[PDB]
Amino acid sequence: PSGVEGAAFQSRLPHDRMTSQEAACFPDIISGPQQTQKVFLFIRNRTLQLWLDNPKIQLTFEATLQQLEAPYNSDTVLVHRVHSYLERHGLINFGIYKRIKPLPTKKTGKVIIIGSGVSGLAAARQLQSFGMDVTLLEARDRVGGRVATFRKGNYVADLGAMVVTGLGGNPMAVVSKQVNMELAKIKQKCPLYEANGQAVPKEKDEMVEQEFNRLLEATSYLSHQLDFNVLNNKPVSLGQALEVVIQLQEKHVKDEQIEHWKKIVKTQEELKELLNKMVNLKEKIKELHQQYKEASEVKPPRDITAEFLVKSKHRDLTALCKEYDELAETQGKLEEKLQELEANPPSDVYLSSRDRQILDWHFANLEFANATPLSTLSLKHWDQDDDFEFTGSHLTVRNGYSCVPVALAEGLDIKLNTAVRQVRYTASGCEVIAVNTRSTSQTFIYKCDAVLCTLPLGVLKQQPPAVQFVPPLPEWKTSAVQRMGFGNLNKVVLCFDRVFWDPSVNLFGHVGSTTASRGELFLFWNLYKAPILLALVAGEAAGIMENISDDVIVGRCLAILKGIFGSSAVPQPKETVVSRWRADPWARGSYSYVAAGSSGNDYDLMAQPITPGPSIPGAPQPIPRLFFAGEHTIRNYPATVHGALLSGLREAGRIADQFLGAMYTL
Amino acid sequence: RKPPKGMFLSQEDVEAVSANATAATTVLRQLDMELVSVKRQIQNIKQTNSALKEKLDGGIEPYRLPEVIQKCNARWTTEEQLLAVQAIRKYGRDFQAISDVIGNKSVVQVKNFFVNYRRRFNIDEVLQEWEAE
Numbered sequence: 001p002s003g004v005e006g007a008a009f010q011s012r013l014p015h016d017r018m019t020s021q022e023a024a025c026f027p028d029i030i031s032g033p034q035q036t037q038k039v040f041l042f043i044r045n046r047t048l049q050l051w052l053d054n055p056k057i058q059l060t061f062e063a064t065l066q067q068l069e070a071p072y073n074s075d076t077v078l079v080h081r082v083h084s085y086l087e088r089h090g091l092i093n094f095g096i097y098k099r100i101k102p103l104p105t106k107k108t109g110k111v112i113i114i115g116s117g118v119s120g121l122a123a124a125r126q127l128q129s130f131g132m133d134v135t136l137l138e139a140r141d142r143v144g145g146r147v148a149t150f151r152k153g154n155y156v157a158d159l160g161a162m163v164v165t166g167l168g169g170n171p172m173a174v175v176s177k178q179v180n181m182e183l184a185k186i187k188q189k190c191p192l193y194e195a196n197g198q199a200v201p202k203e204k205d206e207m208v209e210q211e212f213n214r215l216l217e218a219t220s221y222l223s224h225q226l227d228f229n230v231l232n233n234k235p236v237s238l239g240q241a242l243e244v245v246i247q248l249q250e251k252h253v254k255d256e257q258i259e260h261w262k263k264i265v266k267t268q269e270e271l272k273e274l275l276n277k278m279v280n281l282k283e284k285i286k287e288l289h290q291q292y293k294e295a296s297e298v299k300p301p302r303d304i305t306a307e308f309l310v311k312s313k314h315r316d317l318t319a320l321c322k323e324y325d326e327l328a329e330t331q332g333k334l335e336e337k338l339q340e341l342e343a344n345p346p347s348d349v350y351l352s353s354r355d356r357q358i359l360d361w362h363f364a365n366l367e368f369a370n371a372t373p374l375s376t377l378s379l380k381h382w383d384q385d386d387d388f389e390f391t392g393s394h395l396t397v398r399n400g401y402s403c404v405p406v407a408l409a410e411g412l413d414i415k416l417n418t419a420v421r422q423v424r425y426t427a428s429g430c431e432v433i434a435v436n437t438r439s440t441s442q443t444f445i446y447k448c449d450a451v452l453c454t455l456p457l458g459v460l461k462q463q464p465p466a467v468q469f470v471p472p473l474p475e476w477k478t479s480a481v482q483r484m485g486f487g488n489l490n491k492v493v494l495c496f497d498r499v500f501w502d503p504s505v506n507l508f509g510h511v512g513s514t515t516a517s518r519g520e521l522f523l524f525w526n527l528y529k530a531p532i533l534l535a536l537v538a539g540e541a542a543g544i545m546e547n548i549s550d551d552v553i554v555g556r557c558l559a560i561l562k563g564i565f566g567s568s569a570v571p572q573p574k575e576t577v578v579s580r581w582r583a584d585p586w587a588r589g590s591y592s593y594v595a596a597g598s599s600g601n602d603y604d605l606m607a608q609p610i611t612p613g614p615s616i617p618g619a620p621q622p623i624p625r626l627f628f629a630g631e632h633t634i635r636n637y638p639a640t641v642h643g644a645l646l647s648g649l650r651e652a653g654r655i656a657d658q659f660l661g662a663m664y665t666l
Numbered sequence: 667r668k669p670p671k672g673m674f675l676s677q678e679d680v681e682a683v684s685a686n687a688t689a690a691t692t693v694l695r696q697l698d699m700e701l702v703s704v705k706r707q708i709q710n711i712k713q714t715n716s717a718l719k720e721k722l723d724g725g726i727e728p729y730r731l732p733e734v735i736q737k738c739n740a741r742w743t744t745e746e747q748l749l750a751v752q753a754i755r756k757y758g759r760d761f762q763a764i765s766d767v768i769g770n771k772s773v774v775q776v777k778n779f780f781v782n783y784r785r786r787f788n789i790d791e792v793l794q795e796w797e798a799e
């Protein structure tokens with residue numbers, strides 16, 4: 001898409017239709033005549049285009065109206081309403097841009113933001129841009145959160161997010177124009193290597209992959225068409241479903257064999273009856289010939305009865321010989337029909353041991369993408385965010401992803417080494433009690449109008465809690481926390497002095513020995529300028545590999561690489577890092593997934609703000625005080641950076657609407 | 667609407683494999699034993715047919731009679747008339763059999779004989795005695 005319509009696409013908006021959000025802010029327009037709606041839509045789309053064409057400078061209402069044509073620039077209040085809406089909800093003027101109108105002299109309202117990950121930082125910038133007083137409390141000694149970047153000398157490798165998953169409609173596309181992000185495309189090709197250290201032939205490499213894709217489609221069929229979603233009261237997982245589908249494919253293989261050999265016995269038993277008939281006929285022919293012979297031995301002259309006997313037996317013999325010849329005809333038909341069936345048997349097995357191991361790699365890769373064992377994923381909902389996927393090649397951040405949060409962090413009040421311990425929210429306001437991570441006895445109190453919580457779902461899940469809420473979070477919120485899944489995947493950064501792998505190959509796989517260890521160091525990444533290889537630990541392996549020392553992990557890494565490239569081509573690594581995301585107390589996992597028993601609706605519940613009870617009984621309904629953002633709060637883009645970013649923007653708009661008022665809804 | 671190609675999944679089959687903890691292993695074993703059962707049943711009848719084939723060795727070659735090629739004649743020799751009467755006694759209405767016994771009379775001539783010499787060879791009596799067997 002291109003033009004004004006492409007701007008709507010790049011902003012994840014339908015170009016020719018008004019969204020639910022727009023309907024709320026402009027109920028006069030959407031309920032009005034179609035012509036006005038199209039004027040609205042064009043204004044919206046054109047304003048977006050303007051911002052998108054140049055995202056390094058602020059787009060003011062004046063600059064917008066300037067570049068608008070008739071009859072679209074005739075209604076100046078409509079333009080002002082649209083621009084304000086777009087600025088408020090962070091569709092325009094978000095990220096890092098030069099301000100034309102320097103920030104308001106004095107600030108209105110006070111917001112404490114827990115955590116300075118991308119979701120926290122995104123909101124902070126927006127709120128500050130709206131003229132609010134903003135302070136971020138970070139437990140770590142750095143910004144970025146799950147955007148973690150290892151740096152040493154010339155080696156730069158991301159231990160957290162790493163990939164921009166396509167620029168088409170990605171808000172990170174805008175950010176990448178604002179920040180010096182060295183984006184490099186990822187070549188799709190991924191050669192696999194079995195336990196022995198030798199490549200899987202393009203024959204099997206395609207047979208197994210196609211079978212994997214087929215098995216997935218099959219689970220989708222099981223879910224939507226056969227409605228196989230509840231088993232023994234428990235919700236069915238993707239893992240369970242895949243197992244069932246595999247078992248039915250092994251069943252069919254045996255069913256085919258059974259009825260093929262069943263064809264053979266039916267034909268072989270026809271032959272048995274024919275051969276019996278033939279043996280009994282050759283028996284009668286043998287006897288009848290002897291009788292004809294004896295009748296011929298009676299030399300002439302003979303009376304007519306004796307002549308008749310010869311003739312009669314002659315007739316009878318040729319008659320029985322006619323039958324036998326027609327039976328030997330049938331014998332030849334069935335005899336070749338048996339060589340027909342025995343020549344082409346059906347499939348021997350569904351999948352061999354070699355095949356099943358390669359399939360397990362494909363399962364590991366899926367366990368990697370969801371950062372969780374397939375037995376935890378919801379069958380119905382695990383892929384609920386597929387429709388919202390971006391277009392274009394996936395890219396890597398070659399200079400380290402941390403450049404993004406660091407750039408966002410500029411000009412913001414951030415208290416590092418500050419671990420929030422308690423959140424207190426009441427009808428009159430909020431206090432947040434944090435401590436210093438270095439000396440835990442040194443206590444801090446923060447008074448604010450509103451709290452934006454961007455604590456990871458892993459943190460929110462902690463039992464006993466690492467952060468206490470006063471009053472406690474409502475049951476509807478905590479049940480969403482328990483239901484939702486928070487998965488885990490880890491990385492091994494290997495820094496060498498020389499490139500000993502294929503420089504044109506971005507990623508290559510290693511096929512594990514067992515199902516149990518399919519996730520263990522199953523994938524390797526070559527992405528950086530420097531000689532750095534990156535090893536992935538997924539599925540059930542991730543959690544277990546955290547209890548194993550770096551030396552042993554790096555050991556197993558070298559072993560695998562030796563098997564693939566040569567026992568003397570793989571040198572000792574100069575620098576090594578191994579991530580432990582489940583162990584990390586400020587994460588308690590890697591990112592969320594749609595657990596069995598959960599749905600995309602739980603993400604909506606997570607995003608819902610909390611309104612305290614009234615202080616004085618009988619006092620009017622209070623303002624909402626506790627707001628939530630982050631990866632686990634955005635239904636359509638969970639478990640991503642852009643998702644976090646977007647959730648930040650979402651809350652900043654909601655908070656500003658609440659505490660600065662929406663002037664654009666009139 | 668329908669499963670993928672090379673993929674087999676029916677409502678009936680799903681319920682049968684998910685009936686309990688190891689209903690999957692049970693069903694797959696019943697077919698594993700069914701296969702072994704049918705496979706050894708094959709070798710059994712294969713062995714039976716191999717023995718029956720060896721008893722048919724040589725075919726019916728030493729029992730074949732050379733082809734008698736004789737031209738069809740119109741006139742009935744007394745000999746042929748007597749052959750006919752006996753052929754009726756043994757075969758009844760199988761005109762093809764009777765024609766073959768005589769040798770030089772066509773199937774139609776045989777049928778004509780039945781009408782022509784009907785009273786003179788009491789063919790009614792001859793036929794009713796064939797039915798008596």
Ligand SMILES: Cc1cc2c(cc1C)N1[C@@]3(C(=O)NC(=O)N[C@H]3N2C[C@H](O)[C@H](O)[C@H](O)COP(=O)(O)OP(=O)(O)OC[C@H]2O[C@@H](n3cnc4c(N)ncnc43)[C@H](O)[C@@H]2O)[C@H](c2ccccc2)C[C@]1(C)N
Pocket residue numbers: 114115116117118119120137138139140143144145146147159160161162163164165368369370371418419420421454455456459466467489490491581585586587589590591629630631632638639640641642643644
């Ligand atoms: C881990 C991990 C994650 C990601 C990738 C790899 C790994 C290894 N990779 C992806 C990638 O390429 N591309 C992506 O876009 N996302 C990737 N993702 C997910 C994104 O990284 C992830 O969604 C996003 O970055 C999360 O942003 P927040 O919602 O803002 O959460 P945050 O924790 O950052 O901020 C919270 C802050 O609060 C603080 N705090 C805590 N407690 C306290 C306290 N008491 N008091 C005070 N403070 C406290 C904490 O210290 C922390 O600073 C990928 C991906 C994977 C699958 C599907 C889609 C994308 C791929 C990849 C390589 N695998």
